[PDB]
Structures are given as C-alpha cells and as structure tokens.
Swiss-Prot record, chain A:
Annotated positions of the Phosphothreonine modification: 546
Site (Cleavage) residue list: 284-285, 453-454
Protein species of origin: Homo sapiens (Human)
Glycosylation sites: 189, 247, 389, 397, 468
Effect of mutating residue 284 to T: In THPH2; Cambridge
Disulfide cysteine pairs (residue numbers): 117-143, 198-279, 419-445
Effect of mutating residue 519 to R: In THPH2; Nijkerk
From-to range in the entire protein, with total length: 29 to 682 of 2224
Entry protein name: Coagulation factor V heavy chain
Protein's gene: F5
Domain annotation Plastocyanin-like: ranges: 2-143, 153-279, 298-445, 455-588
Transmembrane segments: none
Sequence positions that bind Ca(2+): 89-90
Stretches assigned to the F5/8 type A domain: 2-279, 298-588
Length: 588, 593
C-alpha cells in the first residue's frame, strides 16, 4: 500500500500568446501551493501525479472560477462516486472541498510492457469547448509496484520531464480573443529555456498528447534512436487523446531543435530550444569484432552531388506538362567528377534519388552556392561529423564546424522484419529548402549484407513534389508561383517520382519474396494508408492487408508469395485525394 | 481455392429510408428466410449481417440489388480465384472475367471465399481478428452509405455449428465513421448517385450489450473516408491492444483503414458515457452506455414473495375464472397455473398476458414451477416474448444469440424453474408474454429476475458489526429486533412527524435502495406509512425533500427513494404512522468503495 494524500488546486494567471508581454490574458491554470492549502521554465502545465499498485488518491480540490470546473482522470479506473462525467462530482463551485477514491486498478497502468509508467491526461470533462480553453491539464504516472520516489524523478532513470502535444482554441472560450494563434504546452517558437541535459544519462521521458483543435501532433526528435512501444521506432508517431514516451540513450553532445512537420507545424514556428552539456558519467563500452570469422569489415566510399537541373517526367499516362526543375542528389562511383554512375535509371526507381544505405566515409559534395545537408535517421550520430543546424546559425566563413562549402567533401526488435527500415531528408530547412525536390531516401538493414562490388527490392514513395519566378512556365514571360489556386494545380503528388505513375509500370515474376522501400515525404497535412490485394504481410507476425503512415516516415513490407494469380495494389481516400490516391501494380 | 465444406449462406440487400436521429441474412439455398435483427443486433442499423467463417472454409455470398445502384464486394487477406473483386480498370487479359464488376439486380451466384491458414489465424496471439466486406465500386459512395459488414475469423473447429456466434465472449462491430448529411445515398434524395456515430445515430443509440466479469471482441474497424484520423474517448472500462501484446495503454487515436481487436473487461456497474475527442467534433457526444449491473441478479424477483403484484397478472383473452392471479410459486392449492384454452392464432393472439414488476426492469427471463392436478399435466414446451416500452410498440423477441434462435427456447418443462438468460439488454416498461404448445393449454407462472442500474438491496448487515439497527433510537421507546428471549411486539408513542431514525450506521456507502418488510408482531403489522424524507449530512442536519413507506401489513413492499441518497448521517423522520409501529424491521442495501 502506497497512500498519497494530495493538495492540488487552480489559479487564474496570464501568459503570452504570439511567442518570440504587457498583454494580459487571465485564464484558470492548475497550480500546487504549499501542502494544506489556503512558470517561465516549465510552461502552463500544472500538477504531476504518481501512482503505484494498491493505492488510493484524493485531491483536496479547490476552485476559484464562477464556471464550476471539475477534474477528470483519463485513467478510467475510477468508480461511480468519482466518475467526472454526467448524462441526463461534475461541478465544483468556489470553496467546494473534495475527496475522491481513484483506487488504482491495474487497467489504467501498464503493469508489464509499456514504458515504466503509463501516461493518461489529467484534465476536466464538463465543458471541453469554452471552460477548458484555459490550460487545465496534467500528467499521470501509474507504474509497476515499487518504483517512484517523491523527488519528481523515477528510481531506475536519471531524468524525467514531459512536454505535452495538445492545443487549446484561444478563441472558442468564454473569455475569447479575436486574434487566433494556437499553443502547445504554452511553449511554441522555442521560448522555453533549454532542458540542459548532458549525455551518458539513462534518460526517460513522457510525451502526452490530446487536443481541442482539429490537427495531429506527431513531433519528431532531432537525431536520436528512441525506445517506444516495444518496437525500435524512430519518429514519435501519435495523434491526440493518448500519450507516447521517449527513452534517450544519449552519447554525444550538441544542440538540436524538435518539431512536427506540416504547413502549420512549422510556419508559425512551433519548435523548441534544447541544449547539451558535459557530465562525467561512464557506462558500458563498445565492441568491434565477432569471433574473427563473421567480421564484416565493410565501409564504402561515396560522393553525393547537388545540381540545379530540370527533368522531364511523364508522357501519356498509363493506368507546363512534364519538365520541372529539381535539385536532387545523385550517386557516384569515383571522384573523377564524370557523369551519373547509375547509367540507366533502371525502371524500378526512376527519378528516385540515390540509394543511401559504420562511421562517415560515405561522403558527399555540395555544388551550389551554400552548404546543403545530408542527415540520416535512427542514429545518435556524433557531432564529430556534425552538420549541427542549431537554432543559432553560426557564421558563414570562419566560425564553427556547422558548414560544408561547395567542392568540399540500433538493434531493431526482431518482431519487425528481418531488418528495420528508415528514410531521411535534407536537414537544411525541413520546409523550404526541402521543398524544391531536395529529398532523398535511406535504407538501413541488418548486418547480413556483403558483396565485393556492393529477396527482391523495389523503390516507391508516395511523396509530393511540393517545390514551392516569372519566365519559368509555358507562359513565356509572365507566370506566377506560390499561388495555391495555381500551385495546387501543379502539386505533383506522386509515388516514386513522376507527376503521375508514368512509363515506369512495375511487373513481377512468381513465387519469390519482394520488398517495397515505401515511404511518405512532403508538405501535405493528411496521413495515408494502403489498400493491398489478396495477400498478407508479416507486421510483427500479424498478417494484415493494409498499413498506415504518418508524415515523413515509411517502413518495410514482408511478403510470403506462395500462390498463382494477378493482383492490383490500390489505396483509398476522400475527394481531395481520391484523384491523387491511385496507383498501378502488375504480376505475371 | 476449393478447401472445405458446402453449406448455404445467403445475403441480400433491401434498401429502405432510415430516419437517422442495409442487408440481412437468409439461411436456405434460395431466398425466403427472413431472420429479424433482434436486440442481439438492434444497434447495427446501417451495418448489415456479420459474415462468419473460420480457417479456410467456404464463404458462399449470393447477393443482388433492390434499388438504383449496382453492388460488388472487396476482399482483404482472403483466398479466392481471380474474378472476385469488382472494379473497372486495366485488363492485360481479355474482357472475359468481367461479370463481377457491374452486378445487376436479382442475380444468384455461388461465390467461394476462404481464409488461408497463413492469412487467417497466424501467430495465434490474434485469436478472432476482424476482417470486412464492402462493395469497392466507390468506397466514398457505398461504404460512406453503409452497405457494410465484417468477417470475424477465429480458429478451425471449436464453435457450435451453425450458430457461428462467439461463445464465452461478446462482439462489437462499430465502424466509427463520420456519416455526414451531405453524402448519403439510399435514404437521402439529393446525392443518391459533425455526425460521429456508429451507423450515423447521434446523441442516441443505446442498447449496447455487456455481461459482468467478461471481456469483449471490440472492433474499431474504420475503413471509410480516411479523413477521420479520430481519437477515441471511452469511459467505463478501458480498451488495451492485444496481438501486438505491448500496447496496454487504454485510449487510442482511431486511424482509418486500420483495425484492432480491443478488450475491455467490464467490471464496474452502471451507466457510462462515450465521446469523440476531436475538439469541435465532440459536439456529437455519445451518451450511449452498456448498462453494467450487479453480478448477483440470478434469483427471482417478485412472484414467490409477491411484489410483482397479483392484480394485473391477467390473461388478455381470459378463460373462465382460473385467472393467473390466484397463483404463486408453488401455491398451496390445485388452481395455481395460468392456461387459457389453446386457440389457433398461430402467432398473434395465442394466450398472452401483460405483466411487470411495476417499475423499470432488466428481464433475465421467466421460469415456472407447475403443479399438475391428477390428469391435467399443465406444462408448456416453447415460448416467445414481446416488449413494449410505450404500450404501442409491442415488439417481439426473435433473437439470434448464442443460445437464442428464432423461437428461442424459454419455458419447456413441467416442474423445474427452467433457466433462461436474456443475453441482450431489456429496456422495457411492460411486455406481452405468450407460450405456445402444451397439452391443450399453455401453462405458465412467471419467475422474473431483474436488476436496475444500482439494485444493491442485499442484507446490508443490520448486525454485521459495522451498521447496527438493534439500537434503533427514535421518539417511540434500545428495542429488540432479532435479539430474542424477549417480548413479541413493537411499541410507538404518537402518530406524526415525531421520531428520528438515528440508526447507528455511520458508514459512507451506497445502500442504493431501502425496503420495509413485514413480520408477525402479535397482530397485524404496524409500520411507517410515509416519512418526510429528510436528509442526513455531516452535521446536525435535516432537509425537507428538496435534494411513502409501508402500507399493507404482509408484504415485502418498498417505496424506493427515487434519486440515490448517500451521506454520513442516517435518519428518516416518519411523517405518517400506521397507528403505531409493530414489525421486526430489516432494511436492505450494500456498500460501494
């Protein structure tokens, strides 16, 4: 038994709205006074809440709001006397003292294989529209018995803090403001001071996510392999109503910025401002050789270019026009600075970039007028070979090592495929400089790939050629760009590249396992799913028939072809993308 | 892909006009076999039947059309031949196999669908996963309309045939789709060729099924218009993911196209709400519960004792004067069993009745104990029941549950109070009950079982050492309730709002109801006729009823306090009096935590 007598209340305080502040905005916010009742570093989040097995928890609930604002735990374990909902303990007038019996049944907790503690939300349930639009949330922490300590931190973990991915509609409240700008933990535009955590810490986190406005919050960390949901995933992929976590096995230092990626998540500037320092911890070491026979002494030379060329895509469509500019990468075989090594873009990748597949002797070479980036996922890569595009961009000529002038040069959970998969992008600007075709595709696999010159592969990616002055179109002298009525008329939503699925029509033999290096890139606000045909995958030994995807992600696909027939791969969507979600696929 | 056994499996498509605020299932080789979606399926609405096969068994699907739209059907993870999809696209082969794409009305086929062992159940952590069928002509114009259905696939064998219903487990097929007003087809008129609810019924759709200390086979198979990247809100008992046995979270953002077989473990009595956690789409707000009750409503409730009053236990069509009123549970007397001379109103006006506990009940079923004369056997063989909430929709019960068939076997014996469990919820105020076949006269004395949302009236523990009544203090005297070796009476003083019932309980619990039973206190019982139901909060508290008793001597008569009352003190000053008090009292209730 771990009883927890609590004192938690609320308060009406203000906070800045357009972050970069006389402007006062009195809103009810959760706080926590000295026990028995009578900021600019953490945000607007209120109280925390531990929980262990065999516990009963009350909240001496105070309230100083004319609208009787109550409280509701997304840990549904509660009974009848502490529900918090109501149909035809729900309303708290000022001064009304309360005492509940949120006895932890093992349902709201993980008690097994989730993060060390589950995480719901700690927000009201009476009026989610007007009254709630004020920042009345919080994190829970129901764990396996015998872990938490009252010092705000876990036992078997070095540091714990939570940033919540939600939003309150700052104009659908009783105290509205006719100047709309949304919020996320009250910490957008990186006004949050750094969570200056060093390396070598066995860090663990919690990533809560609900909403009061229609949008998804799938924020991705910046360079880190995470520990989420028993599967060695990479980008935090979640929407509202629930919560993810983050366990950061760190190693090197630096400075990174995290955010989600939509035309809305990056315009206003929803980001952070993190920082890494130094600390004297030292844990386990590394290994380099395996029994002297399965050595795999492998490493490959590479040179990746950056050219401002134009390319023609699609003639007549199978079941200006086709030439549009594109700054895309190209693969090389030698430093001799000759031609395109892929002499015939063989009809499986098409105009898909080089197949970027161990430290960095896989090099590149920019040819534009500014340093442009190459950065893969799934690596806690050392800033010894940085490209640290921090929030403060250092100088252009003689400052630190953040630049590359032109001319200059992870054990996945075996429940997945026989090896994991991960793509990348251009790390300069994940919204502007990535738009104009500057997108590549990555593929990491297992330590079972060897050959001298370096069971079926296939390139595809349902990206969009969102390449957002005067003479650049069929109109000889006067044409316009960045016009949504004309730009959504040139949005080249595509699989693998061509404006629609062009001449590159894909066929396949019989009774052989295939793999599709499928992904999803671009600045489109929706998520998609696939609509396969007459066969099944192996998604953790769950032979399904379809697979979803969030922005800037796309994993593997394992097939057990053991039959005869012809099929056709499709993908369903509503009217704004039904005309775009069509795709061909053949068989013998 | 020919694999298994051959059996009839008939489907159709009857297009109607459904007021928001379509298939069914036939059984024989041809048509003509209407099985009505009873209370076991009276919430599916737009959802059709539930196609049910197992591991690599044949799935016959004869279907047609009855309006102005050709249909088809898509297949996910199923095994079948080439021409069995239904979509106009490129054909590298000739135009031969094009007789599954434009289906014309009134056409019988003979399909052959299967679920390959590796495509059905694989890695047996996924027991009964949910598939689906849907005409893929325009998933935006016929799944958005609701010509829909699942395909629940389990193991290969252990499930009683051909009931194909999930045994020892319940089943939900809730496609949480944003059925919008702008795009409806069969019921709507404009586009024939903000509302987030199953089958497009906002603010309503009760009647969800449940049973205590069990789980479910929940399915949030959202496959329609992929813009509903929803976020599910769920109170009551939480849904945690299996298969991938490492998602015991509880709340899950519903992404379209995908699906997952959730389990919830119903284990808290009462009504709970639903919601949709999308900000402004929460205005849908489903106040739809699956009424979890107490696990201990397995015993009779008003014919042995007699609160289901013996006044309206009347046969609609009477018979002489052996009315069902003089009967009790094995009543000391020959005439104790209702039976009207059997007439041949083959399904309408057979000897039927109208009965009720005189309150809101959740009928578990009816039982009977016959008492044969010396030649009249007086026994029934089968049974049906109809429910009527507002006394004009006397709706029959032709269920299709695990052990419920068309005329589900109710009363069927001569002596044993036969056990019948109504698996779907009962939401009724009155009923009409008609047994059929007997020995020239259908015999019945009903044994009802029910439990309301609370119904905790068990022995509260008047002597449990926690909440005593022996000390019963008041202005009428401590006393002697079941502390025998004493005199045989109760004594009062006057007759007005005099006493205070300081029953030394002092426990904060949930005695959901109260009952005033009778006794034999030297004469006819004197009791409390009524009491100005005054409150009893933490202080020296009273409250005129701004938040009846016993009336007849012999009877378990109750006047339930209409709203639930829970507080710290215990007191009920009696406003009236039966000229005195004379009864060994015994109240009933329980304790919540």
């Amino acid at each position: 038994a771990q009883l927890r007598q609590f004192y938690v209340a609320a308060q009406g305080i203000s906070w800045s709205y357009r972050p970069e502040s006389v402007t006062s905005f009195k809103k009810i916010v959760y706080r926590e006074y000295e026990p028995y009742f009578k900021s600019t570093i953490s945000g607007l989040l209120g109280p925390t809440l531990y929980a262990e097995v065999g516990d009963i928890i009350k909240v001496h609930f105070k309230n100083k709001a004319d609208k009787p604002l109550s409280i509701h735990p997304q840990g549904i374990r509660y009974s009848k006397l502490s529900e918090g909902a109501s149909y035809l303990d729900d309303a708290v007038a000022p001064g009304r003292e309360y005492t509940y019996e949120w006895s932890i049944s093992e349902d709201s907790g993980p008690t097994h294989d989730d993060p060390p503690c589950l995480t719901h939300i700690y927000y009201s349930h009476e009026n989610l529209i007007e009254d709630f639009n004020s920042g009345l949330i919080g994190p829970l922490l129901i764990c396996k018995k015998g872990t938490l300590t009252e010092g705000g931190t876990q036992k078997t973990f070095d540091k714990q803090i939570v940033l919540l991915f939600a939003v309150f509609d700052e104009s659908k409240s009783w105290s509205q403001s006719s100047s709309l700008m949304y919020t996320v933990n009250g910490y957008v535009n990186g006004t949050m001071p750094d969570i200056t955590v060093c390396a070598h810490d066995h860090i663990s986190w919690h990533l809560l996510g609900m909403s009061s406005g229609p949008e998804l919050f799938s924020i991705h960390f910046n360079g880190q392999v995470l520990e989420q949901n028993h599967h060695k995933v990479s980008a935090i992929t979640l929407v509202s109503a629930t919560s993810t976590t983050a366990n950061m096995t760190v190693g090197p230092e630096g400075k990174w910025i995290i955010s989600s990626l939509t035309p809305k998540h990056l315009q206003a500037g929803m980001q952070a401002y993190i920082d890494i320092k130094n600390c004297p911890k030292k844990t386990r070491n590394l290994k380099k050789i395996t029994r002297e026979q399965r050595r795999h002494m492998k490493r490959w030379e590479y040179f990746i270019a950056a050219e401002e060329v134009i390319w023609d895509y699609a003639p007549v469509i199978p079941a200006i026009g086709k030439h549009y500019k594109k700054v895309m990468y190209t693969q090389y075989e030698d430093e001799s600075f000759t031609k395109h090594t892929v002499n015939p873009n063989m009809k499986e990748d098409g105009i898909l970039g080089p197949i970027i597949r161990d430290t960095l002797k896989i090099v590149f070479k920019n040819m534009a007028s500014r340093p442009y980036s190459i950065y893969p996922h799934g690596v806690t890569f050392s800033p010894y070979e940085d490209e640290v595009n921090s929030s403060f961009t250092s100088g252009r000529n003689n400052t630190m090592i953040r630049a590359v002038q032109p001319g200059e040069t992870d054990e996945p959970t075996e429940n997945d495929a026989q090896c994991l998969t991960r793509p990348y992008y251009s790390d300069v600007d994940i919204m502007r400089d990535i738009a104009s075709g500057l997108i590549g595709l990555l593929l990491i696999c297992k330590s079972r790939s060897l050959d001298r010159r370096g069971d079926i592969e296939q390139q595809a990616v349902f990206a969009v050629f969102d390449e957002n002055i005067n003479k650049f179109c069929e109109n000889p002298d006067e044409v316009k760009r960045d016009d949504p009525k004309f730009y959504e008329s040139n949005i080249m939503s595509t699989i693998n590249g061509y404006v629609p699925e062009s001449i590159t029509t894909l066929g396949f033999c019989f009774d052989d396992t295939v793999q599709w290096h499928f992904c999803s890139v671009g600045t489109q606000n929706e998520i998609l799913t696939i609509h396969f045909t007459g066969h099944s995958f192996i998604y953790g030994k769950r032979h399904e028939d379809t697979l979803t995807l969030f922005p800037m992600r796309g994993e593997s696909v394992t097939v057990t072809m053991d039959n005869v027939g012809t099929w056709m791969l499709t993908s369903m969507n509503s009217s704004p993308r039904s005309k775009k979600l069509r795709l061909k696929f053949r068989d013998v | 892909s020919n694999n298994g056994n051959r059996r009839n499996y008939y489907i159709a498509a009857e297009e109607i006009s459904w007021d928001y605020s379509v298939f069914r299932k036939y059984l024989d080789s041809t048509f003509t076999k209407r099985d009505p979606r009873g209370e076991y399926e009276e919430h599916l609405g737009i959802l059709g039947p539930i196609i049910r096969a197992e591991v690599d068994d044949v799935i016959q699907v004869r279907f047609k059309n009855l309006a102005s739209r050709p249909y088809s059907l898509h297949a996910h993870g199923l095994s079948y031949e080439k021409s069995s999809e239904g979509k106009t696209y490129e054909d590298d082969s000739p135009e031969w196999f094009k007789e599954d794409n434009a289906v014309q009305p009134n056409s019988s086929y003979t399909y052959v669908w299967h679920a390959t062992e590796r495509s059905g159940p694989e890695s047996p952590g996924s027991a009964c996963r949910a598939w689906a069928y849907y005409s893929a002509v325009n998933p935006e114009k016929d799944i958005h309309s609701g010509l829909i259905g699942p395909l629940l696939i389990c193991q290969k064998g252990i499930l009683h045939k051909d009931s194909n219903m999930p045994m020892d487990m319940r089943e939900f097929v809730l496609l949480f789709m944003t059925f919008d007003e702008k795009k409806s087809w069969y019921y709507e008129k404009k586009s024939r060729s903000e509302f987030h609810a199953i089958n497009g019924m906002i603010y309503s759709l009760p009647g969800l099924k449940m049973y205590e200390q069990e789980w479910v086979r929940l399915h949030l198979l959202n496959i329609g218009g992929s813009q509903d990247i929803h976020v599910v809100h769920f109170h009551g008992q939480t849904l945690l993911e299996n298969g991938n046995k490492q998602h015991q979270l509880g709340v899950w953002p519903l992404l379209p196209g995908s699906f997952k077989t959730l389990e919830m473990k119903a284990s808290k009595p009462g009504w709970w709400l639903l919601n949709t956690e999308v900000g402004e789409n929460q205005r849908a707000g489903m106040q739809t519960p699956f009424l979890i009750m107490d696990r201990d409503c397995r015993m009779p409730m008003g014919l042995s004792t007699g609160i289901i009053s013996d006044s309206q236990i009347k046969a609609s069509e009477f018979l002489g004067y052996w009315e069902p009123r003089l009967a009790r549970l094995n009543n000391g007397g020959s005439y104790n069993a209702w039976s009207v001379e059997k007439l041949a109103a083959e399904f309408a006006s057979k000897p039927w009745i109208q009965v009720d506990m005189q309150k809101e009940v959740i009928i578990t079923g009816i039982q009977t104990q016959g008492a044969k004369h010396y030649l009249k056997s007086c026994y029934t063989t089968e049974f049906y029941v109809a429910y009527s909430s507002n006394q004009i929709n006397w709706q029959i019960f032709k269920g299709n549950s695990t052990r419920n068939v068309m005329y589900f076997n109710g009363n069927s014996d001569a002596s044993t109070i036969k056990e019948n469990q109504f698996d779907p919820p009962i939401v009724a105020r009155y009923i009409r009950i008609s047994p059929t076949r007997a020995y020239n006269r259908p015999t019945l004395r009903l044994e009802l079982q029910g439990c309301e949302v609370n119904g905790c009236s068990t022995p509260l523990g008047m002597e449990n050492g926690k909440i005593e009544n022996k000390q019963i203090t008041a202005s009428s005297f401590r006393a002697r309730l079941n502390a025998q070796g004493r005199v045989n009476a109760w004594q009062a003083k006057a007759n007005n709002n005099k006493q205070w019932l300081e029953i030394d309980l002092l426990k904060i619990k949930k005695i959901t109801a109260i009952i005033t039973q009778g006794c034999k206190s030297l004469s006819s019982e004197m009791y409390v006729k009524s009491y100005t139901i005054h409150y009893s909060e933490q202080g020296v508290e009273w409250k005129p009823y701004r938040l009846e008793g016993n009336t007849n001597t012999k009877g378990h008569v109750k006047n339930f306090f209409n709203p639930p009352i829970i507080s710290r003190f215990i007191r009920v000053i009696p406003k009236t009096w039966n000229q005195s008090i004379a009864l060994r009292l015994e109240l009933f209730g329980c304790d919540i935590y």
